[PDB]
Every structure is written in C-alpha cells, then in structure tokens.
Amino acid sequence: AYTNSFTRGVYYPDKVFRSSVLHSTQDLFLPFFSNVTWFHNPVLPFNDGVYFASTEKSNIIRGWIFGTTLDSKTQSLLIVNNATNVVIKVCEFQFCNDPFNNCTFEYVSFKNLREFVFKNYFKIYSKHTPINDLPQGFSALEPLVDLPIGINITRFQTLLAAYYVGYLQPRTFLLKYNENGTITDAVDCALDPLSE
Amino acid sequence: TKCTLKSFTVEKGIYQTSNFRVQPTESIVRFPNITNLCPFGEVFNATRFASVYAWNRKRISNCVADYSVLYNSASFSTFKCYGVSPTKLNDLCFTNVYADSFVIRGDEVRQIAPGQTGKIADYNYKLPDDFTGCVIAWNSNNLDNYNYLYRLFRKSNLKPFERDISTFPLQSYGFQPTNVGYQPYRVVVLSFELLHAPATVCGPKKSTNLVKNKCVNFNFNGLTGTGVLTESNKKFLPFQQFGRDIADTTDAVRDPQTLEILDITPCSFGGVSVITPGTNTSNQVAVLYQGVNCTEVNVFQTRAGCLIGAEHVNNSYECDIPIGAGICASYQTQSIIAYTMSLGAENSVAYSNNSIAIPTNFTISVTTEILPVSMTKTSVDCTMYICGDSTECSNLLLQYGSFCTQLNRALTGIAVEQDKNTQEVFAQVKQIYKTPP
Amino acid sequence: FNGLTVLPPLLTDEMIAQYTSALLAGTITSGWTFGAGAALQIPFAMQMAYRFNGIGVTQNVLYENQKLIANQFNSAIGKIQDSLSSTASALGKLQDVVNQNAQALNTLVKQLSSNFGAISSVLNDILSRLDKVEAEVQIDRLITGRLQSLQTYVTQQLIRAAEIRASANLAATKMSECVLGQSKRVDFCGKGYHLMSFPQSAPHGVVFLHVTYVPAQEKNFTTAPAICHDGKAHFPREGVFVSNGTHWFVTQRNFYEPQIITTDNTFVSGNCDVVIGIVNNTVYDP
Amino acid sequence: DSTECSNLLLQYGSFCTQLNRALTGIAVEQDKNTQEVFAQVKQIYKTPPIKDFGGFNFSQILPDPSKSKRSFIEDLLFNKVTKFNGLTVLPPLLTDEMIAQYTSALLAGTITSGWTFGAGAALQIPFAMQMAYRFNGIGVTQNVLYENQKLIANQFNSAIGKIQDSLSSTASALGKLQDVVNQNAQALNTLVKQLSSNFGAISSVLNDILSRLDKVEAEVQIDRLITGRLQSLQTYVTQQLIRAAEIRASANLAATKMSECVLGQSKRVD
C-alpha cells in the first residue's frame, strides 16, 4: 500500500547552532509530498539513501539488514535496536527462528512513531515520537551515528506495529531554526513554484 | 596624522588614522580531555606485515602527540612525508587516523603515493587525492620472504583505500625476512582523515584553561578564532558544538570539555580618529576610539565611544569639529574641549492667536555659492599607462581586448562632456556681450 | 606627462572670462531677457525694482532706499573681497575637486609603482630581465594591477563626473533661473528671499554671487485674520492686517510699511460670524 | 587583522586606504545630507505652551516631552522599521534625538511663523493667518479659509487621524525606507557572505588557509582570497558610491522639498 506523508523524515544537517533564522541547505533529503510505500521481511533497494518509519509499541519490528548480500556468507551491514541500546555488525550472520565471520565492524550502544534515515561515508539519523499509512505530521531527526564502515550499501530489509519507506534525493532545502536552534519548519526548494 | 595625510602641516579637523583593537591576551587550545596514546604498537612491531596487494590497516584514536617522535625509533630506516605543507602535522586536532602496513621492494618506498613512477600506489596502495600522511620504512630484518608480493597491472586504478577482493600479475624481488632496491622493505604509513569534527588524535598541545571574559585567540579542537570568551545566555541542541550569527560568522562555542556554552563578544575594535586644530596652531591632539567603552584603552565617554585628551564641557557651541552622536570639539582657553553641540541658539517664538512681527528693515546679503563645473579634462591611454606603449606588453594587453578601448573611450566621453558641462552652464548666451564704457 | 595627460578645454581660461563677461553683461544690462531670446536692454535700477516685486516687496521700496541699498550691495561686495582675500577655505569645493583629481591621478601613479605580486613595478625591469616565457606571467600580474586600478580609477572618475554633472546641471539651472531669471523658489539661491545673482568663473568651476534680500530689523504688533466694518467682513488685497496697539493698518508681508485699510486695498467677503478672531475696525473709502 | 595577509595586501598599494577614503567621503556626505536637509535654519525654535492654532491640532506631529521627545506619529515610524566585524556603523552627528529637536524647531517655525524663518529668523503670525496665505499661494482667496475655518481644521485633524490609521495599519509607504535599510543589510551581509566565498582558493576562510598551508604555498592561495575579497569590497563600495549618489540626489531633492515645501510653498505642480 501507499501514503503521501508530505513532510516527515527531515534531519539536522550539522553541529551548527543557530537561532530564530531562515537558514538554507543542500543534501540527500526525502523529497516532499513523500508518497511512502506502506508495509504490514521483504528485501528492498537502498537507492539514494533510505527514509524509514515504524509505528510500533508491540515492538515486533527489531531492525534491518543493509548492504549487498544481506543473508550471511560474506560482509553486509546489520542493525538491531531497543530504544537506543543499539547493537550493530557487518558479519556473515545467523538468525533466531522464533525468539518472541569477518566482523570488520561490530558495536554496542503503533504509538511510538520511530523514524530513521540512512546515507553517506555512512551516517544515521533518528527520532522517537508519540502518536495514537504514515500520518502527514512533522519531524526532524538527530544525527546519532557516523560510520566509516565501507559496506557497498545498495540493498536493505526490515527484521521483526507497521512500517513505511521512501528514498532521498540530492535537493536544496530551507529551514526555520528557532529560539533553541530547533528546525520548526522546512521547505523543499524544488517542490513547487511557491516552495521554490 | 601627519604621516597618514602626508603633510608637515595638517588642517583643523577630525581625521581617522587607524583602528584600535583590544589585543588577545591569551592564545587558547581546547578539546575533550583525551585519555590514550596513538596505538603504533599494533602495527610498527607487528609479527606479520602483509603483501601490499592486500595491505594491512589498523585505526589510531584517542591520542595527543608530536607526530615527528617516530624519528626517535632505533629500528626504522626512513620516515618520508607527502608534499602538502608537511609542518602542519602538529597543528589542529586530527579526527580519524590509521596506520597502514605491508611489504615492498626497498626502492618502492618512494612509490607509496599516486602520480610517482609507482608500481605500488594506483593498483594497490592508492591514497585519496588530498589525504594526509607519511611513509616509515625498513628492510624486513629490522622486525621480521618471496611470499611478500606487489601487483604490476589493472585495467584502470583501483578505489581509494579499498581492496578489489577477487580470485592478477604479482612479483617479489630478493625477499627473505632476514634481508635496498631489491630487499623486502617492511612499511608503515600513517594516514590522517579530512573530516571536520571534534578531537580524536591531536598535536603535542593540551587543553589549557577555559579563560572566560578576556579578549583572546583560541582553538576548540580545530575551531580557531579570536574574540572575548563571554559566557552565553543560550541553549544549543545536544549534538551542536558551536553556533553562528545572523551574519553566519561563529557567534558561539561549547567548551569541548563541558556544556559551557560561550557566546563570543568581538575583541573590541574602535575606529581611531585624531581631533586637532591646524597643526601650525597646536600640537595638542585628542583621540577618539569609535564605539568602545572607556576600559582597556582627561578621559570621557560618548554614545560614539570613548574619548581621550579632550576635556569635557557642558556649554554648547556651533560644531567647530564633529565627533558624532551630537559631540563636537574646539581648541580654546588652551586645550581641546569636547561638548554636546548647539543646534543653533534657542528661540521661544512669541506666538499667539493675535501676535505678529514684520521686518522694519533688511540687508542685501551678497553671498557666495561655490559650484564645480568640470573636472580637469584628464585623458589616458591604457597602452601608454599600463605598457609605456612597449610592444612586448601591448601584445598581452590586446588579449584583454576591448577594456582598453572602452576605458580610453569612457574618459574621452568625460573629456567631451567637460566642454558640454561648460557650455550647458556658460553658453546659455549664444551671442557675446560687451558692456558700455 | 607620464602617459597620463590633460587635454585643454575648448573654452580656455580667458574665453570663460569673456563668456562669463557676456553672461554678466546681459545680467547687468538686459536682466533675464537674454535667456529667452533677445537681450532687451533695461536700466539696472528698473531691474532690481522687478526683483523686489519677485519677493513680493513692492518696487517703490527700492527707490526710496536707492543709494542706501547700493551702499549695502557695494559694502557686501567689499566684504566678499575681504572674505576671499583671507579665506582660502571659502574655495573648499573647488580646491577639494582639484585635490580629488590630483589624489586620483597621484594614486593612479602610485599604483604604477605598486607590484601586484610581480617581481617589480618598473615594467622595463621585466623586459630587461626575462624571456616572454616568464615575463608574460609577471607582466600579466602588472597589467592586471594597472588595469584593475584603471577600471577602479575610471569608475571613481565616472562617479565623480556624475556628481560634477549633477552639480553642473544644478549650476546651469541656477544660471538659468537665478541669473537669466529670478528664482521664486526659496533657498534655491541660498539664504534670503532671492533677487538676482552674478556669475564669476574659477579653475574648473564657478561662483555665484547671490544677491538675496534678507529681512533684518522688525517691530512687534497685534494682528487679526479679518476686520468687520458693516457687519460685512473685509480682507486685504495683498499683505496683512496689523495694529501697533491703537490703529489698524494693512502692510506688505516682507517689509513694514503701514497703510490705512480701505476699499482701495480690500475686498468684502460676506458676514463676520464665520471667522474666528475677526475684529472691529473703521475702513475708509477714498 | 592577519599580518601574513597584510604583508601581501601591501603588494596592491593604496586600494585599502582609497576605499576607506571613499567611505569617509560617503560618511561626511551623510552628516552633510542630514545637516543640509534638516539644519536649514541656524536656531532651535521652542513651541509655545498655549496651542491656540485657530482649531488646527498638531498634537500628533509635535513632541510630547514624556516620550526621546519625538512626536506621536514618529513613534509609528520608529516602530514599523527594523554585520559587526570589519564593517562598522558610525553614528550620525545629528542623533535621532537632535533630529527630533531640529524637526520640532522646523515645525515650530512652520506653525508659528510660516516661510519667514527660511529667509530671516522666524517672524510669528497666527496659524489661521498663515493658512490664508497658503490658500493665496494656490490662487484660492484668503477668505475661503475663514468661511470654512473650523471645517478645514476638522478635515485636517481628520486627515491627520487617517494618516495615523494608515501608518498604524500598514508599513506600505515606509517600505521606501525599509528598502534602504534592506539594501544596506543585503549589501552588508553579501559583503560578509563573500568572506565565505572561495574565489578558486582551497578555502574561503583566511585563517583556515593559514592553518592549512605553509607560507610558500599559502601565498599562492591568499593572493586569490585577497584578490577576490578585494574585488568584492571594491564592488560593494561601488554599489555604495552609486547608492550614495542616488541618496545624494534624494538628499538634495529632500533639502529642496524642505526649502520650497516646508520653509515655503512650491508652486511647482505635483
């Protein structure tokens, strides 16, 4: 299935504090009027970079495989999470059937609408938010991870609530930073003549 | 003032001469308080060094060092470095680093960078184009074979710091682990990454005191600047480390050791002007520091900044010399005074709903209005000016094309226009007229 | 003289002196008329009488002060000779324009001696020192410097020439309206109500001698916006009503000369009641 | 303020001083513009205490001393209208306070004495007697004022009210001055943003080059930065000079409007 989610999946571009100002920027971003595919396990392309969201509280969604081959035998990225205690690796994996080599990198850190973004080397941004098919609300994602991991990230698949997917593009954007340097609003500079 | 204006006498006036600046009392260095030393021991005495077609690498992190200290080693034979300003090794903190290690022929120590006469770099050890580093090498006997190998060819150069893992022409020279040009040379390269971030692997400096409220030069990891380290009244985002003004210049820094958000006040500039009578009339001068507070500079304060050597006065006068913000100055019983200027004399007008005044007499008031009506009719040739009309230069001036013609023409336009201005002014009589005797 | 040059004017210093003499001769001997077309000769005593009417001071006032005005005019002319005999800084603008020309050219010459990252600023050194293999690089920097300096200088000259041209239009305008005419426009001929002005030339410039009328001594009076005489209100034809404190007069707006208020100097305008501050009087009828 | 850069700025001789001299010429021209617009009479005139102006009510255009003692209407003007390094604002000689004094003096003469304070010192006259002359200066006979006096005062007082409403409701006219502020702000922030332009150098920040390069290399790039920043500075100053010529035309026009339209009555139609 599908939904135009419009405006979610923005992320903070830099460590630069600013305030009460209409700053401008250029990066791999989710194009606005964001018609995401809706899922309710499959393997997907990564394209320009991934935007992902899970509406969850049963927490049946667990993480993702990323990279090239995904299913063991040679290096590909894997992430699994619970809030922010994340455990991340690139190995030739193995999997638990019903839990309900070459690790050149390994590390340990509906109502929860948890949003995630992945791009180049590699970076990850994320945000937990409360709610009570992705709704046309607002978010901005913190740049929580930096990743000299070198995996040829071209494919991905969720590991296991409901979830939704879109792809970035290199686009120009404009941002309304506030009294505490929070991005309170944004404009896609190629969405329509008004946004331009 | 005489030196600025180029005269052994300067007229009565105010003259800017300079800009005063509060000098930085400190130069500062800070970063998070690093707790380890660069792990060279994982590489520079490793029992195996790889065949360079599959070169070894390990990360270096959490470190403070002089990167020249590897010249102190007993076992290393050489320690060469790449061409991009190599003394900068010990400047601002590095943010990610590696030690890269392998075996080659000893003549190939020069080949550990792309664009050389190299067999090693572009098909095995390819550096990214502005990546930073040095090559440290010895014959293998200084640590620990024909199984050491390098690759002769590929259809094009391989990826920067990447290995094209595949099932391929390889060679070895006179190699034994007990054996310059055909000896197996054990190499370690130090590779330093370009990413702008807080500290990981720093020069021989340390985190000094966070000296607040002084005008200072500073660095925070690599965020260099100069200003007063005033504390902020502002909140960053948790991952933001510094901030920028409406002017986009750095407004603020977090202490790289703490949530101490500092918002910088500029190290105070102040446009220096001399107020003077004609220098023939006095050598006494009064000195204005535009916009400063009377602080780290008779003395007096104005809305236009701090003032020195003028003496403050309450009485208002016509503005003999201006200072700004309504302040003016004069030289009188003598010394330079300074005062809030007269707006002319005050006059409470004798108004009423039946009050009038009518002039009983008048002055004819024959008064000069000066007007300029031309420049000097200047003219120039670009060729004679730029080149002295020298042929060897004029050739090159013609490669810049119509600039000559349009400039020479523009001034010709002005020159024609001067006699135009002159006739538009004076030639309003077409005749000439002769006065009576 | 160093590849920089100055062209002469077409109208040289003494030609300008004849041209200004023609303007001034027309101004003395024919008033404003020589601007319009024919320089119709007019006695200068009839000319300042017209300039008086052009400030609303009636021309009888001129002749009833004729020589006394001349003494003030001649005295003011003398004080202008004194002012200029002392005050070099009276010519501030012209000396400043000359100084800005000189500063621009001297700066342009100093920039001949500027290096712009060349090994020298004497071009001949490079030509004496190097093959074109390198001299083209050095000469390119020096050209780039001298050329940017020219573009800069020429821009200053052009912007300054636009100020000069605005000033010249303003001057031409004052020569049209304030010389070949009288400006009714207040302060367009400087302080005072304007009568007439005279041109005098200067190096690259002009001076106007503005003969403005300025009112001086004054007397203090009661006044009213109108008077009644028949329950009809009455009003002045020109000038304004005043009383010294015992008798009402009409007087002209810019010089105290009282007249008995009469049908000869007033108009009726209906009943009094509409007016705030109208006063009783007796108006005479000749 | 870098010495290593200043050593290379010296290759280009006079330009830094020439720009500062041009900007000084501009700065003098600003005080001169202000002086020659506002200071057209060499006196302050005090307002009378009694407001016996034949029914006309200047209370919104005149000072209130409880306020800087601006008028009512001037507060609308200051309210509706809206960067620190190398760049400097300099104060006017005539502060906004002194300008309020001078505009009050102008206005006090313009109320109490008509045009006369433009020629001599002020000679006072009743305000309705001044307006009867202003009627005479549009070929409308003096009695036409008095035959409608209180009604004309009501039209005027009401029009002053509608002016306050228009100015309170919208900045629509003040856009013409917010435009100058904006042009300055744009030019100044452009001039700052140009410090962050590379001009083909390996960095835009001079201190970054001085941190990144040893001087034999650094010169090669710093020459680019200097040339670019300088060319931009000259460009900016040229914008400011052309804008200063525009503002000078505006100031002479304004001074002329003050000389003819305040201190007098310009018959020059529209």
Ligand SMILES: *[C@@H]1O[C@H](CO)[C@@H](O[C@@H]2O[C@H](CO)[C@@H](O)[C@H](O)[C@H]2NC(C)=O)[C@H](O)[C@H]1NC(C)=O
């Ligand atoms: C107008 O003022 C002038 C001075 O500005 C008066 O001039 C004097 O006139 C008398 C004769 O009337 C002479 O004896 C004096 O020597 C003059 N003094 C000067 C300084 O010139 C003139 O009288 C005044 N006229 C009127 C009508 O008030």
Ligand SMILES: *[C@@H]1O[C@H](CO)[C@@H](O[C@@H]2O[C@H](CO)[C@@H](O)[C@H](O)[C@H]2NC(C)=O)[C@H](O)[C@H]1NC(C)=O
């Ligand atoms: C107002 O002006 C009138 C006319 O000049 C003055 O009245 C004259 O005063 C003189 C001296 O007292 C007498 O010789 C005349 O006969 C008076 N003329 C008339 C028509 O009465 C009057 O004195 C002046 N008042 C003031 C206050 O100056």
Ligand SMILES: *[C@@H]1O[C@H](CO)[C@@H](O[C@@H]2O[C@H](CO)[C@@H](O)[C@H](O)[C@H]2NC(C)=O)[C@H](O)[C@H]1NC(C)=O
């Ligand atoms: C002008 O003088 C006339 C008299 O000549 C004044 O008119 C009198 O005014 C009073 C009070 O309003 C009435 O009681 C009388 O009946 C009026 N008499 C006549 C003959 O009209 C008039 O008030 C005076 N006005 C001024 C402003 O002085």
Ligand SMILES: *[C@@H]1O[C@H](CO)[C@@H](O[C@@H]2O[C@H](CO)[C@@H](O)[C@H](O)[C@H]2NC(C)=O)[C@H](O)[C@H]1NC(C)=O
């Ligand atoms: C003169 O005009 C002012 C306003 O332009 C009048 O002041 C107002 O007076 C009323 C009471 O009459 C107050 O409620 C308002 O608050 C006042 N305005 C302001 C801005 O405060 C003044 O009354 C008028 N006076 C005359 C004689 O016309």
Ligand SMILES: *[C@@H]1O[C@H](CO)[C@@H](O)[C@H](O)[C@H]1NC(C)=O
């Ligand atoms: C989203 O895209 C699909 C095709 O990719 C389209 O069929 C669907 O109608 C779109 N939905 C919305 C809400 O735009």
Ligand SMILES: *[C@@H]1O[C@H](CO)[C@@H](O)[C@H](O)[C@H]1NC(C)=O
């Ligand atoms: C990365 O791996 C994929 C397989 O997942 C491969 O198809 C692709 O060609 C590789 N990437 C690039 C940039 O070629």
Ligand SMILES: *[C@@H]1O[C@H](CO)[C@@H](O)[C@H](O)[C@H]1NC(C)=O
């Ligand atoms: C480990 O590395 C080799 C290359 O050295 C690769 O071919 C293989 O697929 C990897 N094996 C596993 C189990 O990840």
Ligand SMILES: *[C@@H]1O[C@H](CO)[C@@H](O)[C@H](O)[C@H]1NC(C)=O
């Ligand atoms: C958090 O996430 C990973 C994946 O589920 C898990 O290995 C880790 O143990 C979790 N943290 C805690 C505290 O259990």
Ligand SMILES: *[C@@H]1O[C@H](CO)[C@@H](O)[C@H](O)[C@H]1NC(C)=O
């Ligand atoms: C900024 O943070 C403070 C608490 O530190 C909060 O009171 C305020 O509402 C915040 N403002 C915005 C716009 O985030």
Ligand SMILES: *[C@@H]1O[C@H](CO)[C@@H](O)[C@H](O)[C@H]1NC(C)=O
């Ligand atoms: C710096 O040192 C102090 C004392 O050890 C410590 O509290 C602080 O967290 C350190 N800061 C960083 C970020 O290293």
Ligand SMILES: *[C@@H]1O[C@H](CO)[C@@H](O)[C@H](O)[C@H]1NC(C)=O
């Ligand atoms: C390796 O050992 C030799 C001395 O045997 C010494 O010169 C060299 O610096 C050592 N390097 C490290 C990292 O241990």
Ligand SMILES: *[C@@H]1O[C@H](CO)[C@@H](O)[C@H](O)[C@H]1NC(C)=O
């Ligand atoms: C110096 O200037 C004063 C006026 O300020 C003047 O009186 C004096 O004659 C001058 N002296 C010389 C030697 O220039």
Ligand SMILES: *[C@@H]1O[C@H](CO)[C@@H](O)[C@H](O)[C@H]1NC(C)=O
């Ligand atoms: C100077 O600094 C003091 C600090 O208390 C302040 O009160 C004063 O207003 C300042 N004056 C100016 C003109 O900056």
Ligand SMILES: *[C@@H]1O[C@H](CO)[C@@H](O)[C@H](O)[C@H]1NC(C)=O
């Ligand atoms: C100015 O006048 C005030 C009182 O109005 C007095 O306190 C002060 O000392 C005077 N200062 C000078 C410089 O005369």
Ligand SMILES: *[C@@H]1O[C@H](CO)[C@@H](O)[C@H](O)[C@H]1NC(C)=O
């Ligand atoms: C008029 O006379 C009064 C008498 O008190 C005086 O105050 C006022 O200043 C005088 N005005 C003129 C213009 O003479």
Ligand SMILES: *[C@@H]1O[C@H](CO)[C@@H](O)[C@H](O)[C@H]1NC(C)=O
């Ligand atoms: C002038 O005003 C006062 C009140 O201020 C009034 O009593 C007097 O009658 C008025 N006179 C005129 C001529 O308007």
